[PDB]
Nucleic acid binder design. Sequence first.
DNA 1: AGGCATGCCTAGGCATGCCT
DNA 2: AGGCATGCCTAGGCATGCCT
Lengths: 199, 199, 199, 199
Amino acid sequence: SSSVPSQKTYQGSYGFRLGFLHSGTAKSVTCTYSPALNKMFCQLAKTCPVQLWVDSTPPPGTRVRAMAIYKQSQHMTEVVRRCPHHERCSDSDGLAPPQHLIRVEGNLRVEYLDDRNTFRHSVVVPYEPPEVGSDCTTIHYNYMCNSSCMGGMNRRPILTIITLEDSSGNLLGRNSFEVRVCACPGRDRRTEEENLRKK
Amino acid sequence: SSSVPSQKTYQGSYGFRLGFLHSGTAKSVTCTYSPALNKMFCQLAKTCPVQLWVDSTPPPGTRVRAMAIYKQSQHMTEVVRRCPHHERCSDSDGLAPPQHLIRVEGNLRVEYLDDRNTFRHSVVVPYEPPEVGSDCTTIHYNYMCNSSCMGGMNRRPILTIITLEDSSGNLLGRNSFEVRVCACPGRDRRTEEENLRKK
Amino acid sequence: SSSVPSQKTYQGSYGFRLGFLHSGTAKSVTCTYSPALNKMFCQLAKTCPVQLWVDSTPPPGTRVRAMAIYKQSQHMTEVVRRCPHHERCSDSDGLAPPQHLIRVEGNLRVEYLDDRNTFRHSVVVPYEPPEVGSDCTTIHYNYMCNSSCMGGMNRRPILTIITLEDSSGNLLGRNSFEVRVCACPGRDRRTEEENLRKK
Amino acid sequence: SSSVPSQKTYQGSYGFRLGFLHSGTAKSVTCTYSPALNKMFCQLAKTCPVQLWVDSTPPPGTRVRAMAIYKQSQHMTEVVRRCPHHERCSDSDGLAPPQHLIRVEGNLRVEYLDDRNTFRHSVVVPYEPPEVGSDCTTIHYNYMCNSSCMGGMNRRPILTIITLEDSSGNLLGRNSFEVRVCACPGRDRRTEEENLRKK
DNA sequence: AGGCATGCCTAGGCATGCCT
DNA sequence: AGGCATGCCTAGGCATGCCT
Ligand SMILES: [Zn+2]
Ligand SMILES: [Zn+2]
Ligand SMILES: [Zn+2]
Ligand SMILES: [Zn+2]
């Protein structure tokens, strides 16, 4: 009955884990991931590659959902949406609704969904197994507002929750990670890791 | 026949206990809990996470009720309500009556009830067992007046009484805690703990 | 066209002036007037005597009106009225609307008015000339909220505007003074006068 | 033919001048005017008193119009309006259209106009002469976005253009001043004045 | 990439009905 | 009458997109 999706890591029967690319720590790198914070730092609308790893191939018709929630207890109830400014700027690829924060690029079967009870947005693609001789598949996500956007995330941290779901909407696996969308992900990742260390 | 609900701790057959998050002692932290005082300090309308722990899962259709009473003997008879100012400020989410002090956020099955004999307000949600691999569930409560509100709590301390109730309104368990809603929960928790020590 | 009454002092052709009584400035005197601040300090609902002085007798049917406005430019446009708690206190004399800040006591011809355009409150009594060998007439006003009332004056200072008006509605004279309604008028007068002299 | 209003000062035959109130330049004063910069610094939606001074009294039916234009040549052609977040905040008084930057408060005859050719917004009140023994009349303007609002003024300076216009629409006089709507008017005024003198 | 911007987070300290 | 309460005013300093 909670309207807040769970964020609990659940590797599940198929051994579901996420993977992220080692990037530069240059000031304005487009996407970078901090293991220490379990946090992705990225620029608005740039490609954020996320690897899916499983120990065993899930059943056919399995789906991959991405949803954002505010991380802080104080904001968890609020639906993460795009700010009014970016919602009106007609940057849609034709598939993604202007209100949705998370897009998937380069997938012909993407679906953008809206929970009729919680009003929360999400973007779903079918799960595909890796090519023979590869260990993972990679989804290219895009975040369409900055963390700081007035009237949107308004500087609040979010978590992206990725779930592996069988065809019948049951939970196969869940992982999550924090996201900051910002102008200078390298600077900001360095600042946050140093702040963690300093205090 | 008493119009004052009981505050007596009753762990009961299911081992019912409350839990609270460790928070900053920063001056204006939004919510903080003092074990020495069994007292929660929080800001008006901010999220107050309350954990529910049971040794054994209660029967289905079990419900979780929250009710406020004045803590002092001198005031226990008086129904705790919102002050006239906040009652008229049209801040309702559409579900909570403007008169009710305690709200629950993020729950699709919340009910706001009113005792026909005592006129006391309460807010109820269905009990849900923890997710597999978690020990507790968490309810997000909100207190919609400061303790100091003129015409309302008027600087008097309250207790929140959480009861675990079976489908047929029988008591399964009961816990309670003091609450101060205030502008600077960190300062005020330090002051009260130090006052306890000094005298 | 402006919805804010003028406060401009206008003694007019009848020589219209206000006077105040000397009051012992004990910490909690019921009412005291500071000439240096042109400001009255009084307790909620206590008698505030205000003297009407005039060089020439006004024509029959002259009336005396009192209105409150917020003193500061930031609040001028907001109608001065009672806070929600004192509005529902059921303390009307059967004549004053429960929302009106200013009442007149001890007058068989008092009338309370609501401006249909500005929605501002005022209280009118007929002007009576002094008795032979008296120099002035006194009106007894009551202020039915503290300056600090939440949802009412909310610590903002107000002016009382006293107008002398003939039966045809012409302005014959106007005077004003600041008001603080508070628990300890003698203390508060002393504190503001001190603050005045340290500027 | 130009869609940009003229800002050219024109006191005209009635000696039309603007005046401003002396304000205390605390860090967050609500409104302050810098004569050296001819610039008002004010907080979002707070009262900005603007004095209208005139040597000869304008004819009946004279109106006072306020419009905003971007100050820099690079932005002059762009209509000044509210950002998308604030346009959708539902903060109208029931009279100002939600898109208009400039409101007039406390006037029973305000009208909000959209130019059918340029689409620029303006707000108009009737001109009222000063009361006898008064030297000027004051309008209370409000600005409903910060200069920094994303998707609105976006940190670009604007000018407020005040025109005195007869009922037939003749220009009787024109004055203007720069505006910054910001969180800390006293600070920001100090900083820009400092920057001016280091040049 | 260096460094400014500017709303906003923070703590010190005052307020003011009210307790003693 | 003395002195505490407690929401909130004040100033310092950080944020973070963006200018140079
Ligand atoms: Zn955005
Ligand atoms: Zn309240
Ligand atoms: Zn009141
Ligand atoms: Zn805006």
